[PDB]
Amino acid sequence: DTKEQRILRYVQQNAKPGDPQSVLEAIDTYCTQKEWAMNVGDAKGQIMDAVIREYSPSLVLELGAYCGYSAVRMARLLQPGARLLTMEINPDCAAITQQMLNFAGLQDKVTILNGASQDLIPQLKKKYDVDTLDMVFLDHWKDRYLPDTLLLEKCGLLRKGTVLLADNVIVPGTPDFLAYVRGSSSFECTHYSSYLEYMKVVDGLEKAIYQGPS
């Protein structure tokens, strides 16, 4: 028995199959009541929703799936024929995410890439026929926000207007990523102040929109 297995079991036992919203509510509730977990959460999640609806991205890359929360959260808002790719380094997590998605009936929108973002990113074009990404959600590991951003730019995966949206720019924090995007002419940055999931510690998401080469 693992915490993530408990979360998936709670969903299967409580959420309406095929209804993404009830799946989100089931997760939020269990982690609000029984056991904190690092899902992006409902407060930050509403900000994500608002940004998704603005940009209506056809191709979203997620870094870090975990239990599938934000994948569910995002894919439920995708237009028909839009796809989300999510990268997960931990097999136990990737398979729980696959199940969470299957239960919400979003499996056909979502493709889980198993492995480390740094290894998978260079393989997107060949193995998944990706041209450029419309949106990227950074939410794996703070140390990799900056390295992986440079990777994406280098692998030609960013176009003018690509939206990078980063979670935890305040807690646990991503100082170097923040300083880089805020300092670079290649990004237009906006900060959304929210709260750490299932808590009232202050956190935020950063939107950094790629402007193209300088």
Ligand X SMILES: Nc1ncnc2c1ncn2[C@@H]1O[C@H](CSCC[C@H](N)C(=O)O)[C@@H](O)[C@H]1O
Ligand Y SMILES: Cc1cc(C(=O)N2CCN(C)CC2)sc1-c1cc(O)c2nc[nH]c(=O)c2c1
Q: Alpha-carbon distance 157 to 155, whole Å?
A: 5
- Give me the least distance between CB of 168 and Mg ion, in Å please: 5
User: Which listed option, Mg ion, ligand X, ligand Y, none, makes contact with residue 69 (CB within 5 to 8 Å by class)?
Assistant: ligand X
Is 167 catalytic? The answer is yes
**Secondary structure tally for the chain: helices H, strands E:** 9, 7
Helices marked H in the chain — which ranges? Answer: 3-14, 20-33, 42-55, 69-75, 91-104, 117-120, 124-128, 142-154, 175-183
Residue from 42, 139, 203, 206 touching ligand X (CB under 6 A): that is: 139
How long is the chain?
214
| 136 contacts: CB under 8 Å, gap ≥ 6 | 60, 61, 62, 63, 152, 162, 163, 164, 165
| 185 contacts: CB under 8 Å, gap ≥ 6 | 211, 214
- The tokens 């915490």 sit on which residue? 3
Residue from 43, 95, 151, 171 touching ligand Y (CB under 6 A): that is: 171
- Does position 4 interact with ligand Y (CB under 6 A)? The reply is no
Give, in order, the Cα–Cα distances in Å from 152 to each of 36, 60, 145, 147, 172.
31, 13, 11, 9, 23
Site for ligand X in 67-126 (CB under 6 A): 67, 69-70, 87-90, 93, 116-118
Residue from 18, 91, 172, 212 touching ligand Y (CB under 6 A): that is: 172
- Give me the least distance between CB of 38 and Mg ion, in Å please: 5
- Does position 194 interact with ligand Y (CB under 6 A)? The reply is no
Site for ligand Y in 110-149 (CB under 6 A): 139-141
Residue from 167, 177, 207, 209 touching Mg ion (CB under 5 A): that is: 167
Is 25 catalytic? The answer is no
Is 14 catalytic? The answer is no
Measured from the CB atom, is 57 or 204 closer to ligand Y? 204
- Give me the least distance between CB of 205 and ligand Y, in Å please: 10
The interface region with ligand X, picked from 32-40, 153-161, 170-178, 201-209 by CB under 6 A, is: 32-40
As annotated, the active-site residues are: 139, 142, 167-168, 197
Name the site residues for ligand X (rule: CB under 6 A): 38-40, 64-67, 69-70, 87-90, 93, 116-118, 139-141, 144
